[PDB]
């Protein structure tokens, strides 16, 4: 699918739907997690506790509360196990799935979420960049990097 890279906060996206990697016990922590529990309110964690534990590597969806989207995809990393990539490559996968059965047109990721946690930053966005590729172009993915220094690192990535 097309991929832009803009820097900014990922709870000010305006789109579709965004992509939060999780824990598959969909408990949402601190950091962007934990300010996506914050503006967009309660309503999604305890969306997130009736849905319950999921698999790593699936992906399940709830809606945004107050955020200025209409759902939060919620792609599990780790949890029952380490985020291995192969992981990373699922809950992606398994992500961009979810778009598609929604018939979405803009998502965004956040650019090293909880898709560190514990994992070689760079090895990642290789990784994730190579599933969206594979989505449909009628999904526009966009990569909400922290720093302005990081959007450069997800354009060379791709300039090659």
């Given at each position: 699918?097309?991929?832009?890279?803009?820097?900014?906060?990922?709870?000010?996206?305006?789109?579709?739907?965004?992509?939060?990697?999780?824990?598959?016990?969909?408990?949402?922590?601190?950091?962007?997690?934990?300010?996506?529990?914050?503006?967009?309110?309660?309503?999604?964690?305890?969306?997130?506790?009736r849905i319950g534990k999921i698999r790593v590597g699936e992906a399940?969806?709830?809606?945004?509360?107050?955020?200025?989207?209409?759902?939060?995809?919620?792609?599990?990393?780790?949890?029952?196990?380490?985020?291995?990539?192969?992981?990373?490559?699922?809950?992606?996968?398994?992500?961009?799935?979810?778009?598609?059965?929604?018939?979405?047109?803009?998502?965004?990721?956040?650019?090293?979420?909880?898709?560190?946690?514990?994992?070689?930053?760079?090895?990642?966005?290789?990784?994730?960049?190579?599933?969206?590729?594979?989505?449909?172009?009628?999904?526009?993915?966009?990569?909400?990097?922290?720093?302005?220094?990081?959007?450069?690192?997800?354009?060379?990535?791709?300039?090659?």
């Amino acid at each position: 699918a097309r991929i832009r890279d803009v820097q900014g906060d990922i709870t000010e996206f305006q789109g579709d739907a965004i992509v939060n990697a999780a824990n598959n016990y969909l408990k949402l922590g601190a950091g962007v997690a934990g300010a996506i529990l914050r503006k967009g309110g309660p309503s999604i964690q305890e969306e997130c506790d009736r849905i319950g534990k999921i698999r790593v590597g699936e992906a399940a969806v709830t809606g945004a509360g107050n955020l200025p989207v209409r759902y939060v995809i919620h792609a599990a990393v780790l949890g029952d196990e380490p985020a291995s990539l192969e992981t990373v490559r699922k809950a992606t996968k398994s992500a961009l799935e979810k778009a598609v059965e929604l018939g979405l047109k803009t998502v965004a990721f956040t650019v090293p979420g909880a898709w560190v946690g514990g994992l070689p930053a760079e090895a990642v966005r290789r990784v994730m960049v190579e599933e969206i590729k594979k989505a449909p172009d009628t999904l526009e993915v966009t990569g909400v990097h922290g720093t302005e220094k990081s959007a450069e690192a997800c354009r060379r990535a791709r300039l090659e």
